[PDB]
Specification:
Function (chain D): Component of the NOP7 complex, which is required for maturation of the 25S and 5.8S ribosomal RNAs and formation of the 60S ribosome.
Order of helices and strands of chain B: HHHHHEEH
Structural class of chain J: mainly alpha
Protein name (chain D): Ribosome biogenesis protein erb1
Family (chain D): Belongs to the WD repeat BOP1/ERB1 family.
Shape of chain B: elongated
Strand content of chain B: 5-15%
Subcellular location (chain D): Nucleus, Nucleolus; Nucleus, Nucleoplasm
Chains: A mainly alpha, B mainly alpha, C mainly alpha, D alpha+beta, E alpha+beta, F alpha/beta, G little secondary structure, H alpha+beta, I mainly alpha, J mainly alpha
Largest sheet of chain J: none
Distance between the termini of chain B: 65 Å
Oligomer: part of a larger assembly
Keywords (chain I): Nucleus, Ribonucleoprotein, Ribosome biogenesis, rRNA processing
RNA sequence: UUGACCUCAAAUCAGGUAGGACUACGCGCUGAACAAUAAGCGCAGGAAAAGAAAAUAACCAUGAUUCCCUCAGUAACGGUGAAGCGGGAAAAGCUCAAAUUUGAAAUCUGGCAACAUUUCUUUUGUUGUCCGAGUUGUAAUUUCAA
RNA sequence: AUUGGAUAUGCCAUAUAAAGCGCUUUCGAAGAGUCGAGUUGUUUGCAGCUCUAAAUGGGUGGUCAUCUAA
């Protein structure tokens, strides 16, 4: 039950070596302990996750530029995507629906003042 | 059937070793070596395992069966021309207002001296017509 | 579809006459068989006592009634229920014993061949 | 530990060719691999005119050239598609193997006790005899 | 020519079971006890036929009269029949000799019997025809017969017969029973199928 | 021999009987993320989990992912190092899949992702061991079959109110770039992770941490 | 209660619009005095009562 | 008894003995009619555990149905139509090939005295058992229509129950 | 209104009228004669059973009962023997006495031996005395039926009386 | 309440292996022969391709426990055959 | 030669039996447009179907089926929509396969013959006898509660 | 007039029989192209297809409980 000494012991048993180059592993431990107390406040949580991500990515990118690994995916690459293109097209139709709904809303908001002052 | 199997072998999608193991089934152990023709003929038409077929293999057969003279200049132009001129010759081959009054009152079907598309009016629907316009 | 209940007083009477018809046949013995006392199976009802289906084989054996003669004298048998505690055993063993004391069993005419 | 390796018969493998642009985009570690030059239009036309034996019509994603069944692959397809043993020398008729009845079991299979009917005169016939004796008494027989 | 359909079926079935490769447990039933030993076996069997229903009725009425008017017997001796009964006798190791019909139509009924007799150390023979076995026990058919007990007179006749079945059925064959049967091909048929095979191998593969 | 082309870490994925439509989607979504995983058919035993060691030794997969769905509502994920190692059981909450409308992220299938671990994972020994085990699984080893060479996504694991939050993000190359143009978009894998117990053995052995 | 089918056992549909007839359904066929007569209505003879 | 052996042997349906027999019998059954009378069960052990007795009034009929409803359910209904004076007792798979699944149907003659006088089979003479296979009351019919005891297996929901005192 | 009902409305053949329905008529008692002689046809069966001294049901009643007048530890009990129950009314007392006299009349359950049984056990007795029922059983010649000692006893007691 | 120790019911005895049922299955296994996949699996075991044999049995049967039981059965057949051969 | 058996035919052979109708309620199958619906197809009975747990539960446990009330518009699922428990009505339980009767096929249809019997000269049996069925298994015995 | 289940009583009764309970230094069989797996339809159940079992096994619930299908 929360036996620290054995739990630390197995850590050295499954210890991933520290001397391994980053490109072999690609895991970063962020130097900043991102603390987001209002876990109920989800909106503040994405910002904390965002800021921890971009700092983690920036440190990863710096360690990989010296590793001489092509970070960017070239525009010519056409490998298979984690998301199917078919439902990507659905997500694309979904996004325009929110776009036109929002666009119709602001247009309607314009016409409320337009008709009064017309 | 053979093309789908051959495609799987060449495309490496299905491992060759796995294909060999899948070949030890109830049907491969029913050997046909030396059986008579009266027996073998009905065994092939009836007791022939039905393997799946893929559309890619079907296209491959059509590609194989495509003869060098399947679609020459004539069989693509005049054969297309005859179908076109058949459609052209087929293509060239290819309402009346009635007031409900006098004899036309109280009708149920096509009235006397009325042919083709027709519409009926009784002057009661004028009130509804103005209402629908105002709608 | 609407289910009406205009036959409710009729259903009541028809069931009464079925009890009367049953009693017309089996005249002296009770119209119902004796049911055991069981405890309902949940934390909400286990403090109560209700009627079970039949008496267990262990209950009948302790009461001296064989599982073959139990049905003859109107004692139902529940081959599926079991006695996990002696309280269930004692509760229903004494239920059988009281039933037996209040029971009058009429003799039967038997066949008796002349020789051995 | 189990080394997390790949046995030579694992169903997962790299470079899965498909039917028919050429998928020459990059390699592992991200380097463009050279496109093999298109074949001589004469040679490509010849292959199209006379399809090779076992022409699968399959191109591996790396090379634009088609993949064609070899002689041994053609033989394997022959056996598999005709529903025979895919092994040229495999015995489908092995000699009978008596791995169980090669020795004699000394004892009877059953340990049930012997009933007394088998040592006393038959009760079915004694019942029948008494029924016959009754019919003789009553004049039925 | 036009054979009737049922006659063609019978004759094609005869040839088909000859041409097809027959598993050893079914192919063992094509090797049967020789005529001389089968005749001697049936000579012993015919001394132990069960009493006919008419003979049984006569004996029981004779006892019934004694009971009715005025009134210790020895145990009967006969051959054992019925598939379930004989299997229990082999498994009980009471059978001295098992006689299996060679043409039981669902062969699964007796396909396991020779091995079971082998496992139990029971002398057995596969004899021609279910109808010969049937005649012994006054039936139409008997899938199997068993000798478990004979009279002390016939102990030597059974022992000599068991020895002959050992020499002429089990000592013989043995290796023959372990081999797949079938593949029996006619003289000109094997040449003809060779012509069919070479023609097929040329270009008839698809 | 033992194996040809020995990749460092291989994963074995099993779903127990009783997994729902949403839970199956999560497994397929996870398997797509890690190409070094070997999907398998349903396991008949809801209690005899020592067979997963025999599956792993056969399949040469040193990391087992067991998706246990009890009472057809509660989804649990068992992550273990197949030979011996720590078997850690988690409870899954608030499932969001690829087909969900909101997410628009897009990463190469099998591209090695950048793993980001919350520093709270280095506070407790059990939180450490979970981090080390999670790193050895999600981190796609080099040369894994079906993997892609470039890098397009980052996986973020953070401990909040004791629940591990797993978020998968896709890096974009902002037109202006300038200040680090990570500009990550939610890929779609969104769920809440809750450690329940940890076993010193492989799907067995005495408990070493209890929630 | 009334029969749940009383007033429905006939076959009739409205003759339409523009024919100088109230658009109540009328009984089809011919040769009987019922033919052409209205049906399916509280206001109609041999029709359905309102809210049976 | 030999029925234990037949029941253990019927489990090895693709062994050399059973695969060979399947070939020869499937060929034999295809030479015969689609529905033909069987002089005896091919699987006497299977027939008798399904209710078959080797007594007068029991009939075995063989039928082949094409693969690709349940084929066993189709087998019983077509055989029941073929012998319309009998009662479909049960049915069992006997053989199959690529095109055909083969079944033997057990039927009972309700007008035979050997059936009308046997207390263990009298129930099928009673007229509530006319065409059990047409109403789903056979073993395969019960399984097809979901009848079963457990949790794995309308009108009281579509009806509004209005009581007198409501 | 049916075609089959209009058929016999316009018919001349009279309707097959049967007169069987008289409600409130309770089923008359067959079965027990003593219960029949003391059953009053007006009362209900619960009223009749209670008046006669019998229990209609040995279980609880699922409702209120009529009130016409203003009413004024395993082993010990598992081993105890409930000392019968009193007969409250005359009819119950009549039924009890009728059962006892019937049982007394049908009480001689023991049978004599037949000719064969008597000769069977007599021959066994004349050789092994009258106590060694184990040895009589193992006697193979005289005990041809292979009766056991318990059955050879039952023959001996049945011969005595 | 006071607990009681209930004995086993006869229905829970089901699944127990009988000496006659063990014998009958051993006889049938020898007489019938083996399925095409059993012949393939025993060939793999003889060639010492144990890992490939276990994969085939699991693929053919469907579950790992069924595969393990079949492999153990066929392996003991291989030993039994060699003892007699 | 003679004869067993298997399989398969034939008969205005001896004796049976099926169809069609009704169809409110009942059980299968099929099944739309706007609903395990209508239409279509199959098959029953006075009821049908279901039914003596490969059932629930997590308790101090329940105990075939069905139906009513409740659970409950609840859980779940995303508007659809249960079930266990609880209260009642009625209650009844069982038969096989798998066992060597093996000191005895102990079982059964049918023919013929008497003899009874009847809702009944119309129904239903019994006894005898003979031919068959049946050992590729008919009785008795056992069904896990054992 | 025709029936039903009892009661009394006569005759007949093939009981050399058949049962329940109670004891064990003896035994105790339990249903397969089915379950199951993969996959495709209909709505977990069921159907097709390919593959195809076991013997304290198998099913179902929560190491345990419960049940014993084809």
């Amino acid at each position: 039950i929360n036996n620290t000494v054995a739990l630390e012991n197995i850590y050295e048993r499954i210890k991933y070596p520290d001397d391994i180059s980053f490109v072999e592993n690609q895991a970063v431990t962020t130097k900043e302990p991102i603390i987001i107390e209002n876990v109920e406040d989800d909106l503040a949580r994405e910002l904390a996750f965002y800021k921890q991500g971009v700092s983690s990515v920036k440190a990863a990118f710096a360690k990989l530029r010296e590793a001489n690994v092509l970070i960017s995916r070239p525009h010519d690459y056409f490998a298979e995507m984690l998301k199917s293109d078919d439902h990507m097209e659905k997500v694309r139709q979904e996004l325009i629906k929110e776009a036109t709904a929002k666009k119709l809303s602001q247009q309607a908001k314009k016409q409320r003042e337009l008709k009064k002052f017309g | 059937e053979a093309m789908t199997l051959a495609q799987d072998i060449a495309s490496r999608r299905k491992s060759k070793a796995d294909l060999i193991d899948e070949g030890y089934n109830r049907w491969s152990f029913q050997s046909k070596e030396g059986l008579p023709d009266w027996f073998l003929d009905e065994e092939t038409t009836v007791n022939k395992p039905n393997k799946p077929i893929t559309k890619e293999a079907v296209l491959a057969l059509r590609e194989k069966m495509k003869a060098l003279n399947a679609r020459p200049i004539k069989k693509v132009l005049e054969a297309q021309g005859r179908k076109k001129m058949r459609t052209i010759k087929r293509l060239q081959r290819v309402p009346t207002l009635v007031v409900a009054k006098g004899p036309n009152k109280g009708l149920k079907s096509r009235p006397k001296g009325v042919k083709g598309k027709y519409k009926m009016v009784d002057s009661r629907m004028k009130k509804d017509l103005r209402a629908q316009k105002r709608l | 579809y609407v289910k009406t209940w205009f036959n409710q007083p009729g259903r009541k009477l028809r069931r009464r006459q079925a009890r009367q018809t049953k009693a017309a046949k089996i005249a002296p013995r009770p119209v119902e068989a004796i049911r055991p006392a069981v405890k309902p199976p949940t934390i909400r009802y286990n403090m109560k006592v209700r009627a079970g289906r039949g008496f267990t084989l262990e209950e009948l054996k302790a009461a001296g009634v064989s599982r073959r003669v139990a049905s003859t004298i109107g004692i139902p048998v529940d081959h599926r229920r079991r006695n996990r505690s002696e309280e269930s055993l004692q509760r229903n063993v004494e239920r059988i014993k009281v039933y037996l004391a209040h029971l009058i069993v009429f003799p039967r005419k038997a066949g008796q061949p002349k020789k051995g | 530990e189990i080394d997390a390796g790949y046995s030579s018969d694992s169903s997962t493998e790299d470079v899965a060719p498909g039917l028919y642009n050429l998928y020459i985009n990059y390699d592992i570690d991200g380097k463009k691999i050279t496109r093999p030059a298109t074949p001589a239009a004469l040679d490509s036309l010849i292959a199209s005119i006379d399809k090779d034996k076992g022409w699968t019509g399959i191109v591996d994603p790396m090379t634009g050239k088609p993949v064609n069944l070899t002689t041994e692959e053609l033989g394997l397809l022959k056996r598999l598609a005709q529903s025979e043993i895919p092994d040229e020398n495999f015995d489908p008729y092995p000699d009978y193997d008596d791995f169980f009845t090669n020795t004699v079991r000394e004892t009877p299979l059953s340990s049930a006790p012997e009933p007394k009917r088998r040592f006393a005169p038959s009760k079915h016939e004694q019942k029948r005899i008494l029924q016959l004796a009754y019919a003789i008494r009553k004049g039925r027989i | 020519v036009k054979w009737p359909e049922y006659i063609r079926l019978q004759r094609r079935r005869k040839i088909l079971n000859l041409r097809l490769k027959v598993p050893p447990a079914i192919a063992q039933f094509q090797k049967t006890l020789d005529k001389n030993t089968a005749t001697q076996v049936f000579k012993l069997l015919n001394k132990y036929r069960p009493e006919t229903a008419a003979e049984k009725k006569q004996r029981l009425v004779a006892e019934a009269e004694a009971v009715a008017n005025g009134k210790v017997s020895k145990k009967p001796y006969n051959v054992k029949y019925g598939l379930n009964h004989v299997v229990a006798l082999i498994e009980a190791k009471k059978a001295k000799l098992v006689l299996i019909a060679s043409d039981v139509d669902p062969i699964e009924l007796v396909v396991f019997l020779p091995a079971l007799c082998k496992k139990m150390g029971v002398p057995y023979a596969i004899v021609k025809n279910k109808a010969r076995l049937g005649t012994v026990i006054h039936q139409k058919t008997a899938a199997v017969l068993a000798v478990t007990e004979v009279r002390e007179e016939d102990k030597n006749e059974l022992a000599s017969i068991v020895s002959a079945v050992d020499a002429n059925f089990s000592a013989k064959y043995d290796e023959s029973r372990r081999k797949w049967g079938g593949g029996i091909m006619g003289g000109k048929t094997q040449a003809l199928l060779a012509k069919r095979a070479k023609a097929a191998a040329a270009t008839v593969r698809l | 021999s033992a194996g040809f082309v020995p990749i460092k870490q291989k994963v074995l994925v099993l779903s127990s009987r009783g997994v729902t439509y949403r839970q199956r989607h999560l497994l397929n979504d996870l398997v797509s993320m890690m190409p070094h995983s070997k999907k398998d058919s349903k396991l008949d035993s809801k209690d005899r989990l020592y067979q997963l060691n025999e599956l792993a030794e056969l399949y040469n997969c040193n990391n087992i992912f067991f998706f246990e769905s009890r009472r057809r509502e509660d989804l649990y994920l068992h992550i273990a190092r197949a030979p011996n190692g720590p078997t850690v059981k988690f409870h899954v909450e608030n499932l969001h899949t690829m087909d969900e409308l909101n997410m628009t992220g897009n990463a190469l299938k099998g591209s090695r992702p950048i793993l980001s671990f919350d520093k709270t994972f280095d506070t407790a020994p059990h939180l450490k061991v979970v981090k080390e085990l999670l790193q050895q699984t999600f981190g796609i080893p080099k040369g894994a079959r079906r993997s892609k060479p470039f890098i397009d996504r980052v996986c973020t694991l953070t401990i909040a109110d004791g629940k591990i939050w797993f978020r998968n993000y896709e890096i974009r190359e902002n037109e202006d770039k300038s200040k680090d143009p990570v500009t990550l978009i939610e890929i779609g894998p969104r769920f809440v992770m809750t450690i329940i117990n940890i076993l010193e053995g492989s799907f067995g052995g005495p408990v070493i941490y209890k929630n | 209660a009334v029969s749940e089918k009383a007033g429905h056992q006939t076959s009739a549909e409205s003759w339409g619009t523009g024919r100088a007839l109230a658009r109540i359904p009328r009984v089809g066929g011919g040769g009987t005095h019922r033919s052409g007569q209205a049906a399916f209505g509280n206001m109609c003879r041999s029709g359905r009562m309102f809210a049976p | 008894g030999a029925y234990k052996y037949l029941e253990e042997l019927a489990k090895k349906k693709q062994s050399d003995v059973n695969l060979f027999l399947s070939r020869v019998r499937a060929w034999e059954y295809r030479q015969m009619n689609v529905i033909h009378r069987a002089s005896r069960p091919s699987r006497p052990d299977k027939a008798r555990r399904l209710g078959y007795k080797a007594k007068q009034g029991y009939v075995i009929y063989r039928i082949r149905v094409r693969r690709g409803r349940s084929a066993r359910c189709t087998a019983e209904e077509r055989v029941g139509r073929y012998c319309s004076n009998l009662r479909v007792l049960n049915s069992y798979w006997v053989n199959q090939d690529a095109t055909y699944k083969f079944f033997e149907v057990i039927l009972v003659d309700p007008s035979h005295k050997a059936i009308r006088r046997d207390p263990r089979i009298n129930w099928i003479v009673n007229p509530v058992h006319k065409h059990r296979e047409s109403r789903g009351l056979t073993s395969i019919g019960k399984k097809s229509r979901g009848i079963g005891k457990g949790h794995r297996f309308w009108l009281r929901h579509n009806t509004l129950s209005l009581r007198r005192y409501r | 209104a049916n075609p089959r009902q209009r058929n016999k409305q316009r018919s001349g053949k009279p309707r097959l009228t049967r007169r069987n329905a008289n409600k409130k008529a309770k089923a008359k008692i067959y079965g027990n004669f003593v219960i029949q002689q003391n059953w009053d046809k007006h009362a209900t069966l619960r009223q009749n059973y209670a008046r006669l001294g019998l229990l209609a049901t040995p279980n609880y009643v699922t409702g209120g009962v009529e009130k016409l007048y203003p009413d004024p530890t395993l082993d010990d009990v598992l081993d105890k023997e409930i000392s019968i129950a009193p007969a409250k009314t005359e009819v119950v007392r009549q039924l009890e006495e009728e059962a006892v006299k019937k049982a007394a009349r049908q009480s001689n359950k023991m049978l004599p031996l037949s000719a064969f049984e008597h000769a069977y056990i007599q021959r066994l007795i004349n050789k092994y005395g009258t106590e060694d029922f184990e040895s009589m059983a193992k006697d193979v010649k005289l005990n041809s039926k292979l009766f056991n000692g318990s059955k050879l006893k039952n023959l001996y007691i049945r011969m005595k009386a | 309440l006071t607990k009681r120790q209930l004995p086993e019911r006869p229905s829970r005895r089901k699944g127990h292996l009988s000496k006659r049922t063990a014998f009958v299955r051993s006889i049938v296994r020898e007489v019938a022969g083996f399925a095409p996949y059993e012949r393939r699996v025993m060939e793999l075991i003889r060639n010492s391709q144990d890992k490939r044999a276990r994969k085939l049995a699991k693929k053919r049967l469907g579950t790992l426990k069924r595969a393990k039981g079949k492999i153990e059965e066929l392996t003991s057949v291989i030993q039994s055959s060699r003892l007699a051969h």
